[PDB]
Amino acid sequence: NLFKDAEAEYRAKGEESSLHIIIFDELDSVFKQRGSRGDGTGVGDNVVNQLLAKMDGVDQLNNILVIGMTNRKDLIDSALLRPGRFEVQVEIHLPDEKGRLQIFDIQT
Amino acid sequence: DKEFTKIFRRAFASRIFPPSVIEKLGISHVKGLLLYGPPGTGKTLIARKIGTMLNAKEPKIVNGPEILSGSSEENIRNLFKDAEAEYRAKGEESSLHIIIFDELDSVFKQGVGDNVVNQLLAKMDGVDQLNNILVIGMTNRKDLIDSALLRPGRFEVQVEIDEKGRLQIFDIQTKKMRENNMMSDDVNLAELAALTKNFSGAEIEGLVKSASSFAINKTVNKDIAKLKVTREDFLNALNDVTPAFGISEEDLKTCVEGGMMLYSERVNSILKNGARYVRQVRESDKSRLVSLLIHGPAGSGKTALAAEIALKSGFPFIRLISPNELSGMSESAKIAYIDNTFRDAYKSPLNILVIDSLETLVDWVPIGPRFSNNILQMLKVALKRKPPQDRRLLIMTTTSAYSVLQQMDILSCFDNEIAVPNMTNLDELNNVMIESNFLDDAGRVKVINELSRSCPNFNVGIKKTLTNIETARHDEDPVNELVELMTQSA
Numbered sequence: 001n002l003f004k005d006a007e008a009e010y011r012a013k014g015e016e017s018s019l020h021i022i023i024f025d026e027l028d029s030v031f032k033q034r035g036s037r038g039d040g041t042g043v044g045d046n047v048v049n050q051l052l053a054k055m056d057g058v059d060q061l062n063n064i065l066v067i068g069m070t071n072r073k074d075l076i077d078s079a080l081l082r083p084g085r086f087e088v089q090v091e092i093h094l095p096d097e098k099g100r101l102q103i104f105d106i107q108t
Numbered sequence: 109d110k111e112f113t114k115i116f117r118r119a120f121a122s123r124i125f126p127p128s129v130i131e132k133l134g135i136s137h138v139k140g141l142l143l144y145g146p147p148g149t150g151k152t153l154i155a156r157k158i159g160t161m162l163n164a165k166e167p168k169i170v171n172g173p174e175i176l177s178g179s180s181e182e183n184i185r186n187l188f189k190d191a192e193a194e195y196r197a198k199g200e201e202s203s204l205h206i207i208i209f210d211e212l213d214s215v216f217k218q219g220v221g222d223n224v225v226n227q228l229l230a231k232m233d234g235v236d237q238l239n240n241i242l243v244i245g246m247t248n249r250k251d252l253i254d255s256a257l258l259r260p261g262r263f264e265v266q267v268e269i270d271e272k273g274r275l276q277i278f279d280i281q282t283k284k285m286r287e288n289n290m291m292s293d294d295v296n297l298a299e300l301a302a303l304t305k306n307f308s309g310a311e312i313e314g315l316v317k318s319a320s321s322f323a324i325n326k327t328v329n330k331d332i333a334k335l336k337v338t339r340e341d342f343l344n345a346l347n348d349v350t351p352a353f354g355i356s357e358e359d360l361k362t363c364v365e366g367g368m369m370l371y372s373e374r375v376n377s378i379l380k381n382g383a384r385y386v387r388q389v390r391e392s393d394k395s396r397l398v399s400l401l402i403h404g405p406a407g408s409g410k411t412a413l414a415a416e417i418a419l420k421s422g423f424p425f426i427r428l429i430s431p432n433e434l435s436g437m438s439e440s441a442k443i444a445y446i447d448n449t450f451r452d453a454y455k456s457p458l459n460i461l462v463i464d465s466l467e468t469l470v471d472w473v474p475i476g477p478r479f480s481n482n483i484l485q486m487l488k489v490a491l492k493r494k495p496p497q498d499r500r501l502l503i504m505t506t507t508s509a510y511s512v513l514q515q516m517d518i519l520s521c522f523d524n525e526i527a528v529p530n531m532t533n534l535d536e537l538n539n540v541m542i543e544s545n546f547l548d549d550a551g552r553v554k555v556i557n558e559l560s561r562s563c564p565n566f567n568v569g570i571k572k573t574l575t576n577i578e579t580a581r582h583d584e585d586p587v588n589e590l591v592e593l594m595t596q597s598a
């Protein structure tokens with residue numbers, strides 16, 4: 001239900017469609033490994049399948065950029081770490097001394 | 109092509125004969141074909157091409173993970189309705205139906221994933237004699253396949269899935285940019301192929317996009333006509349993408365990083381003997397296994413010499429077994445790593461294998477004495493095993509504890525020994541000094557005079573000489589350092 005606006009604008013205006021960006025906080029919360037097992041309600045697996053279907057079989061939606069912020073990459077399902085799905089991964093590490101000075105300046 | 113011939117000749121031959129003969133004799137057509145290999149080999153491509161090439165029924169492509177849904181069993185059983193009805197209508201005349209299940213191991217692991225197996229096994233064999241259905245199972249991980257399916261009569265045939273092809277796919281990708289006169293002539297595609305050794309198609313697309321990205325950056329902080337992709341972007345973008353392979357040929361090149369000096373003729377003699385043995389292995393058809401031992405005082409330099417001989421050999425296959433690779437492993441892991449390293453040397457017409465510091469692999473310490481008997485026995489057995497038919501090995505092992513090996517009685521396993529004595533005459537020191545351009549002529553003439561009056565017999569290893577020269581270069585370039593230091597290391 002989140003992608004309806006992008007689909008509508010794409011269908012309406014071809015390549016003139018503006019850029020729509022949606023960002024998923026706490027990505028590892030729901031999209032854990034889809035082979036966890038447990039013999040119970042499967043709503044924790046069809047969620048990944050739905051997102052993967054709307055992200056891979058996009059039907060040529062080329063005006064969407066999803067940003068995912070997390071603290072533990074290892075827990076993310078491996079199926080989403082491949083070309084065409086979350087390609088670029090940027091690591092943010094601890095600041096350097098000059099960055100420390102910049103942060104101190106900004107804070108004060 | 110070889111697999112393409114095997115699968116066609118052996119499996120897909122029975123259907124050619126007139127149907128009545130098959131019906132009468134009772135010969136049974138092979139049912140299962142398992143194509144396996146690393147990701148990106150194109151297993152899906154081959155699966156698709158097989159159906160069209162053989163003029164078979166339109167393939168039913170179904171994703172492995174999508175199988176997840178009693179409705180899963182309903183789908184599995186419904187899959188076979190068309191083939192069952194078609195065979196019922198005609199019989200032996202039914203056309204060949206092919207079903208491909210991508211990522212078989214995803215759902216067919218050792219309870220939807222169990223009921224699916226139940227349905228498939230119930231339909232596949234027993235009451236049914238449908239020889240018109242061919243199921244192709246493709247998986248990147250062969251070990252994960254259920255044992256219930258790994259048995260005779262099911263998936264009998266297993267098939268395992270280059271530089272030129274890589275260049276061709278590069279051309280395929282580049283066509284659009286090259287045609288529109290936006291590519292500089294300096295870019296050598298073959299060079300990029302030589303750089304990309306362990307990359308798959310998606311990685312190639314990624315490198316293309318990143319290299320273009322650098323050209324994009326060059327413009328943005330109406331001259332769009334000058335947007336050109338340069339070789340520098342291709343060189344720079346290589347840092348983003350990464351492969352998932354490994355090579356040890358580099359390890360055999362770093363061991364000689366310090367280079368040769370030819371400070372004495374015996375070095376040339378040893379090299380000559382090595383080139384003789386390599387030729388002997390190359391030419392004789394009876395000598396299918398040659399073992400050599402290279403022994404000498406510690407620090408004289410033995411790994412570098414063997415690595416040099418191996419690099420001069422030029423054989424298709426060369427490898428090194430060094431302690432560094434085994435560090436941190438448990439015993440049951442070392443014994444398997446050593447076994448695998450040997451088992452991978454029997455798949456090529458000519459092979460060279462180098463073993464480094466034999467006594468260190470065995471964990472020898474003289475206080476006990478303590479050592480690991482299992483690895484010792486494994487190596488002793490391996491060093492005498494003849495390779496399979498028509499394949500030839502050359503093994504060179506380096507050691508520094510000749511006496512210990514004598515005690516263990518392992519010495520009977522080697523065919524010949526080569527001794528490498530460390531330099532003792534000041535002439536060799538002069539050669540090394542001129543080779544290392546340590547000092548001018550006057551200093552290099554005074555050093556010998558200073559030494560001759562203090563230490564007539566030199567007896568120092570080359571490694572120590574090099575390190576001493578390096579450390580003396582800084583404190584006091586004049587002789588007043590070196591002669592002392594070396595006298596201290598005598």
Ligand SMILES: Nc1ncnc2c1ncn2[C@@H]1O[C@H](COP(=O)(O)OP(=O)(O)OP(=O)(O)O)[C@@H](O)[C@H]1O
Nearest residue numbers: 365366367368369406407408409410411412413571
């Ligand atoms: N025959 C040789 N001629 C010239 N340089 C050599 C020769 N052998 C070894 N060296 C130099 O010695 C350096 C280190 O020697 P190397 O590692 O082979 O010693 P080693 O005696 O095998 O060592 P270890 O003491 O670990 O048993 C190499 O970088 C190489 O440049």
